[PDB]
Amino acid sequence: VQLAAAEGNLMQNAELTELSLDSSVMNTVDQARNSIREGTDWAATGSAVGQIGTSMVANKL
Amino acid sequence: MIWMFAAAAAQMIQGGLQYAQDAKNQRRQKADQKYNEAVRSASARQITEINTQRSVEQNLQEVG
Amino acid sequence: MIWMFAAAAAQMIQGGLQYAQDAKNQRRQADQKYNEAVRSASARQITEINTQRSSVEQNLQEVGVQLAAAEGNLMQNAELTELSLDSSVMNTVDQARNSIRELTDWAATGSAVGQIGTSMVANKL
Amino acid sequence: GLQLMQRGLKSGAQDITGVGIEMMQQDAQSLSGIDWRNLKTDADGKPLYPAAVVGSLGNLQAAYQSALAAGNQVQANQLLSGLPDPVVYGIRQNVDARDLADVVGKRAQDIASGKVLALPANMPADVSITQADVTAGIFDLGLGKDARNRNMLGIQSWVFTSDADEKAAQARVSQVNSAMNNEYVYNQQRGSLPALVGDDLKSWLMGKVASRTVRVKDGTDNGALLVLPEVGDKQKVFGSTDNGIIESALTESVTNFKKQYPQATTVQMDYDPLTQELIFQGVNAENQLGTTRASIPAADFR
Amino acid sequence: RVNSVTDYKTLNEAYPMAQYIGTVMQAVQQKKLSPGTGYGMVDAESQRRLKMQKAEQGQLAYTNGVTISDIAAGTGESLDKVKGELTKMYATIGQGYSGGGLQLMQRGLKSGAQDITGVGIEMMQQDAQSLSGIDWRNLKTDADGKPLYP
Amino acid sequence: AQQSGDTEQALQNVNSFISSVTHDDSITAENKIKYTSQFVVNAFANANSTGDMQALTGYVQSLSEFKNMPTDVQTQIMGSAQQYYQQRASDESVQLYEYNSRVNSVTDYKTLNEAYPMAQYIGTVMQAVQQKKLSPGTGYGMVDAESQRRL
Amino acid sequence: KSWLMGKVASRTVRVKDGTDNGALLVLPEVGDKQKVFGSTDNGIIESALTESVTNFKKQYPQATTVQMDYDPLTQELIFQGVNAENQLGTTRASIPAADFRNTVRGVQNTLTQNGSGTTQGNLNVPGAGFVSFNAGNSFGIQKNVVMGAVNQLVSYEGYTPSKGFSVLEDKYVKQATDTPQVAADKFNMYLNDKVYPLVMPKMEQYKNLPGYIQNNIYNALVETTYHSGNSDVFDKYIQTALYGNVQEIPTFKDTPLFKDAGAGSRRNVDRYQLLGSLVTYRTNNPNLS
Amino acid sequence: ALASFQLGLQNTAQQYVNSGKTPEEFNVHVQQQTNQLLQEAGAQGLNLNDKDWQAWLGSVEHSRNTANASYQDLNLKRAAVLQEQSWGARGNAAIADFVT
Amino acid sequence: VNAAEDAAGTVVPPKDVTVPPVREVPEVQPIKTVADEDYPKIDIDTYSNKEHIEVGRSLKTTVQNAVLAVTALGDDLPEVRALGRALGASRAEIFNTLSDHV
């Protein structure tokens, strides 16, 4: 039941992200996010988490 | 000028589609539907209850 | 390609088989007399059951309703003005308006207001 | 027939599917006698079709879709080579099963009224087969045991191919084109062509030709490809109605013929009824014929 | 049962190749199947999987292609063949020539391509020929004189 | 997680399930391989941007537990990822055509300027042209067509 | 008027080259287009007519407009200059249909790339992420088969900034300043120039075996050739397994090729699996030649 | 809230005009309505006399002035209409008596 | 090329293009076409049985067409030119490229 509900919620929410390319509200949003997040290589970010891998909890307890 | 009739054409598009779509519905089907309409007469009877029950301006009406 | 229609073909196979079964089901039938009564009776019961079963988010609705009312009010008032050239009312009224207002270059007024538009309250205090 | 065809398709055997298709297309002949224009009419103008044809059309569509679902277009086209023209026209025009009978009925009395233009005396260029059609999936025979027995051309290599295979494929495409041209000419002269155009006619001709193809085995790699001639009844000349025996029986004759004439690239077969004789001859491109020839009586072949 | 599947992702999700090969070869080893009917079975599946993998890439060119030229440049087919394939696809989607043709024409008009609109118009005006045979004067009549069109 | 614009939480969530499956002792090795392969393959199908694809590819190929899998599974996963790639790229280019269709769907002058100012349309088209999502010839023509249609 | 305009509109083609505004032509009516023009699409005829139109305009500068007509009796296409008032000029030209169809087919082949389709691809490089890759080759190997061996070479060799793909001239090796895309381009060039020519010639001997056995052999041969620059090292043991004395197989452990890859690494198990399967295949087919 | 109040005053003006209410009943209603909004504004912000709240007050002033202006003109029109109708009614009876 | 510049390019965008490591070549046939040399220049005489004007005793035109060309390219004529203009607004002619013959 909860899985069906979550699917419905996500489907209903995706509608605004679909129009983000011309909606005016998504210019205030995605500006607030950047202002609240004071050349990022995504590939480099993933490797850092991968190297730690499955010993995360072990290395912090 | 072609560009003057754009709105009229856009409004006229919708008429054609549902004209064809309504016809398709009938081919895909009936007695049960008739019964519901007869029951609808109860609403007319219910609306028939109210229906069955049915200082210068004053001087002007009196004058008339 | 031939292999990108496989799903459509597989889904369309099931349509043909059902179409054949209905023919046999109807041909195997005078039980229609008994069959009809069941629906004829169930329809009434179903209809009876259906008949028996028969901040900001508030200010916004109030604004919508009042806006519709205001538009309606401005209509039915514009109509009388439309007849100004004929009525002689809006002439007898214009006479009084002019008589009372006497106690121009329109472009001049607009510039005068604009020159201090966005500082009126600041200057007043 | 539907169940037999399903069994053949799922078991990966052409022989069973052939006998199933025989029944399936033998039943379909009942649709030719119906008087579409004088069917009894409902109070709302809807005709009243008999229950015997609805369950036939609904099974023909199911069989065609099942054949197409497995990726076997050869035996799907072979099925459409025995049905009446309006039924063939209706099936290929994808439409909801609830309207197939109406479409067929309208098409039949449209044909009866002479609303279709006659075909030319020469086959249209658009009916020929080219590389684009090979890429499209034609000649795909579906599931099978041997690699050589799931391509109608009989080529083995399917992963790494040399130019020798390319030359054989190029020759065999022209061979099939010539066979189709001869079939079309013969049908047109007798005045028996169906009321179809373009892709439908191409599929009809391909299905007609597909039934008479046999892939002889021995002699070299890729074997050889032959198209048997049309005969009154197979049991008098060939002695059997199954191609799997004729394919094995022709091996010695084909090997001898190729041994005598190494320069011959392709072989053609023909039947002479007057002397009860079978004739082999080498062929060239452009529908031209060579000088090599051979003769074999039918008695020893049987 | 293995061959009854028609899509690539679920096939690998349910029937990994390394398990199918082992299942076939174990039976071949125990003399339940002859070698010739096991090797052919393995080879057929090996070829079919590659064929489906190739077809899945060709589907995208039809799905996202904006014109006929770049649709042909992707799949490698001739223009006359991609035209027929698009005709068949949009006839299957619309359940008939009229419905498919209308949608194809709308796509062509909104995408700003004349080639697609042309093939849509071909279907649209090929369907219209059915109207020439109707006998307008002898249509069945309603109790109030209104005809009864099909 | 990524609907809110936080990829790191998505990576942490993926790692949490991978490590939870790895350390269980009640299942056999082949089941451990099967579950991990299925989850890893399914993860790529849900990425909604070309940056998430690269981040997940970087994370996966560095994970130690993925380095020891049989070659025939690593090759299959590598081949499968590259197919969702170029597809998440084609979608990002078709998005601009969809936007242009939406812009062209209006038929009256006043609402067009009220909703789609020219200075914003030009910027939107030119930014995409700059990032090599559209070729120059299919952006300049698009701008010119709108410029002529408005007049 | 609308009916006539619609009838005429379908046969109009706007040739491109020659001057500004190009030229405008109206094709004649024909029985079937596929016999004369060779295609039913106008976008190819428009490109094909360019050379003929340019030549015709070069020969007769004074001509302002051009008209086209078809002569069925001799299978000929005719061009003629036209004047106003429906009057005709004296200039004329003639072109056979055969060469026009040949040119149309040549243009179509270039457009579709001989019908083989596109060959653009992608790669997964550790750390660097996705990069572009072209799978084209001069031997006719289909795309998904070419991509098979590279996905094993990458899974074995790996990638590091200081070593790249471990290619061992100046244009075949990675420099300190190269980006991963440049290194990948050099790796692909080195492959196409120094691996396939030595592996393809030895595939003519294994056509008796099923297709998937050949596919398996291809990957092993490519892997060995990449690391040794010589395909004769492993073909010897393949021949020994298929036809030679099986007792000599275990001696492979003394070769440098085995030592370099580790005594118990996955690379060697993958190599031994192929030889273990070939022996079983030989056993199951006693008539193998 | 500001937008709702602005429309509410204007909508109430004509409703009061149609019922013949005296000006005092309109003025008391206007003051009572303004007081509620002014009190409510005390919690929805400090009302500190800066630029934005000064502009808010400036708009509030004209929102009242406009309705106060329109209320007079509506009655001015209505009185003339009624006078004309009454004068016609007075003229009908003269002809009635003349005929009788 | 010159016939693929009209492609939209929404598949494999320019961000994801690279040169192939081998040189392609199309599969056209080696054929030309050349104008024949021995064909005769056939023309029909339709002016013998009618009155006509011969110039320089080929190109065939009409009198009301030739006259205009004379006035236009006639800047070296006595200001006769007006007579030519008036006549031009009022047969068969043959010259043994019209704008240069005159």
Residue numbers in the entry:
A (entry chain S): 103 to 140, 146 to 168
B (entry chain M): 1 to 29, 31 to 55, 93 to 102
C (entry chain T): 1 to 29, 32 to 56, 93 to 141, 147 to 168
D (entry chain I): 403 to 704
E (entry chain J): 303 to 452
F (entry chain K): 202 to 352
G (entry chain J): 604 to 771, 783 to 903
H (entry chain E): 102 to 201
Sentences from the paper on this structure:
Podophages that infect gram-negative bacteria, such as Pectobacterium pathogen ΦM1, encode tail assemblies too short to extend across the complex gram-negative cell wall. To overcome this, podophages encode a large protein complex (ejectosome) packaged inside the viral capsid and correspondingly ejected during infection to form a transient channel that spans the periplasmic space. Here, we report a near-complete atomic model of the bacteriophage ΦM1.
Here, we describe the ejectosome of bacteriophage ΦM1 to a resolution of 3.32 Å by single-particle cryo-electron microscopy (cryo-EM). Similar to that of bacteriophage T7, the ΦM1 ejectosome is encoded as a three-protein mega complex composed of TEP, OEP, and EP3 oligomers arranged coaxially within the phage capsid. The capsid houses a large ejectosome complex composed of TEPs (, gp48), octameric ejection proteins (OEPs, gp49), and ejection protein 3 (EP3, gp50) arranged axially above the crown of the portal complex (gp35). The EP3 octamer adapts the locally 8-fold symmetric interface of the ejectosome to the 12-fold symmetric crown of the portal by intercalating the EP3 helix α-2 between the crown domains of adjacent portal monomers, forming contacts with the C-terminal portal helix. Through a combination of BLASTP and DALI homology searches, putative enzymatic domains were identified in the ejectosome, specifically a lysozyme-like domain within the OEP (Gly718–Ser903) and an endolysin/exotransglycosidase-like domain within the TEP (Asp268–Asp528). Viral lysozymes and exotransglycosidases can digest peptidoglycan, suggesting that these domains may degrade local peptidoglycan surrounding the periplasmic channel once ejected from the phage particle during infection. The T7 ejectosome adapts by slipping around a pedestal-like barrel created by the portal crown, whereas the ΦM1 ejectosome adapts on top of the portal through intercalating helices which form an analogous barrel. In T7, the TEP consists of an N-terminal LTase followed by the hub domain. However, in ΦM1, the helical hoop and endolysin-like domain are inserted into the hub domain. Further, the ΦM1 OEP has an additional lysozyme-like domain which T7 lacks.
